[PDB]
């Protein structure tokens, strides 16, 4: 029953996330939000998991990986098993889906995990739409005079709004209590769409911390023996 949460920073309106193997931007305060969210837990005896594709792993400076105080899991089609420790703080997996089922096992995890964060990869995010319970999406907008950066990787916005709804009214409650943010819940229009969340401003960008939650589901079938 461990919540699976996608976390990503995306530039509106197309929701671009990467370019040529790196981020299209460099925002310290967005990085800090990511570090604190994925690291902090409400229960001190637990840690969070961070799962990521191989290319995303290789984009992290060798000095900052693996991400400290979080269980790191790198997935690659050419890895040996569904989940194996290869280094202190580093697990390898050849399957995102199996990797998750493995993590959920309370025998294996001893209920010592609080949340599972899918920290990205365009290819990974694309496969996480049916897997994630929530999405922590930082919606980014270039200020009036800011140049829109070039991007080559994007989040599935259609799939997102098809399965999830903007639950940003519940962002603060959803985050680990230790975290404190500067802004307050704001709701504004940008390029036609409604943008709601906790507003921040750094460099030439304005961004919003938002939360997306699974849309209510009809009861069609429940398995019986
Ligand atoms: N803005 C944001 O919040 C974030 C942005 N990014 C950006 O995304 C870009 C990287 O994304 P992308 O290029 O799509 O690469 P990914 O990070 O998504 O990794 C893709 C690789 O992951 C492995 N893989 C994919 N699916 C599976 C699976 N189902 N099971 C096991 N392994 C799998 C494969 O590795 P292999 O080839 O070894 O088999 C594949 O080549 C970068 O530009 C980065 O900056 C990344 C994270 C966050
Ligand atoms: C490119 O360097 C880094 C990339 C990343 C990745 C690419 C894994 C990321 C991310 C990410 C950010 C920055 N924001 C949000 N909202 N979600 C993310 N997955 C993490 C890092 O440590 C925090 C990095 O070093 C500081």
Which residues lie across from 47 on neighbouring strands? 113
What is the number of alpha carbons within 13 Å of residue 197 lying toward its C-beta? Answer: 24
Domain span holding position 87: 1-225
Count of helix runs (H) and strand runs (E) in the chain: 7, 13
User: Which residues are CB-neighbours of 28 under 8 A, at least 6 positions away?
Assistant: 202
Measured from the CA of 57, which atom of ligand 2 is nearest?
8
Q: Determine whether 198 is an active site residue.
A: no
Distance, CA of 150 to CA of 117 (rounded, Å): 27
CATH number, position 143:
3.40.430.10
Phi and psi torsions of 139, nearest 5°: -80, 120
Residue 13's nearest CA partner among 205, 224, 192, 203 is 192
Distance, CA of 155 to CA of 17 (rounded, Å): 7
Of the residues 23, 136, 198, 211, only one is catalytic, namely: 23
Reduce the DSSP state of residue 72 to 3 states and report it: strand
23 lines ligand 2 (CB under 6 A): yes
Reduce the DSSP state of residue 19 to 3 states and report it: strand
Q: Are 194 and 206 in contact (CB under 8 A)?
A: no
Distance, CA of 20 to CA of 169 (rounded, Å): 34
Mutate to test the pocket of ligand 1, among 38, 53, 54, 84 (most ligand atoms within 8 A of CB): 53
Q: How far is CA 199 from CA 14, 39, 82, 217, in A?
A: 19, 21, 39, 30
Write out 103-157 in H/E/C secondary structure: HHCHHHHCCCEEEEEECCCHHHHHHHCCCCCEEEEEEEEECCCCCCCCCCEECCH
The label of the residue with tokens 């989940």 reads: 83
Measured from the CA of 119, which atom of ligand 2 is nearest?
19
Residue 113's nearest CA partner among 36, 6, 35, 2 is 2
Measured from the CA of 95, which atom of ligand 1 is nearest?
30
Q: Beta strand 134-142 with 164-166: parallel, antiparallel or unpaired? A: unpaired
Distance, CA of 8 to CA of 153 (rounded, Å): 12
Determined by X-ray
Compute how many other C-beta atoms are within 10 angstroms of the C-beta atom of residue 26.
Answer: 10
Distance, CA of 206 to CA of 142 (rounded, Å): 6
Which residues lie across from 173 on neighbouring strands? none
Torsional class of 197: left (φ above 0), alpha (ψ -120 to 50), beta (otherwise): left
Distance between first and last Cα of the chain: 21
* Burial class of 51 by CB neighbour count within 10 A (0 to 12, 13 to 18, 19+): buried
DSSP assigned state of 70: S
Q: Which helix (H) or strand (E) holds 127?
A: helix 122-128
Q: Which helix (H) or strand (E) holds 52?
A: strand 47-53
Q: Determine whether 14 is an active site residue.
A: no
Residues of the binding site for NADPH: 9, 17, 22, 54-56, 76-77, 96, 121-124, 127
Mutate to test the pocket of ligand 2, among 30, 60, 179 (most ligand atoms within 8 A of CB): 60
The label of the residue with tokens 């902090």 reads: 40
The label of the residue with tokens 């098993």 reads: 81
Q: Are 93 and 82 in contact (CB under 8 A)?
A: yes
124 lines ligand 2 (CB under 6 A): no
156 lines ligand 1 (CB under 6 A): no
Residue 179 has which token pair? 């975290």
Q: Which helix (H) or strand (E) holds 153?
A: strand 153-154
Maximal C-alpha separation, the chain? 62
34 lines ligand 2 (CB under 6 A): yes
Resolution in A: 2.5
Q: How many structural domains is the chain composed of?
A: 1
Of the residues 30, 100, 136, 171, only one is catalytic, namely: 30
């Amino acid at each position: 029953k461990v919540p699976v949460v996608g976390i990503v920073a995306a530039l509106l309106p197309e929701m671009g996330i990467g370019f040529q193997g790196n981020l299209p931007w460099r925002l310290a305060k967005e990085m800090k939000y990511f570090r604190e969210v994925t690291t902090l837990t409400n229960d001190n005896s637990k840690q969070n998991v961070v799962i990521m594709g191989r290319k995303t792993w290789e984009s992290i400076p060798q000095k900052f990986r693996p991400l400290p105080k979080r269980i790191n899991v790198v997935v690659s089609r050419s890895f040996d098993g569904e989940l194996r420790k290869v280094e202190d703080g580093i697990y390898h997996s050849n399957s995102l889906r199996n990797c998750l089922t493995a993590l959920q096992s309370s025998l294996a995890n001893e209920n010592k995990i609080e949340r599972i964060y899918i920290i990205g990869g365009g290819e990974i995010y694309r496969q996480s739409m049916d897997l994630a319970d929530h999405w922590l999406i930082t919606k980014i907008m270039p200020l009036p005079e800011t140049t829109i950066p070039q991007m080559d990787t994007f989040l599935q916005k259609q799939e997102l709004e098809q399965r999830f709804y903007d639950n940003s009214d519940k962002l603060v409650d959803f985050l680990p209590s230790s975290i404190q943010l500067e802004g307050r819940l704001t709701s504004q229009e940008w390029n036609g769409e409604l943008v709601k969340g906790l507003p921040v401003q750094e460099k030439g960008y304005q961004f919003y911390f938002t939360l997306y939650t699974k849309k209510l589901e009809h009861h069609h079938h429940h398995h019986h023996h």
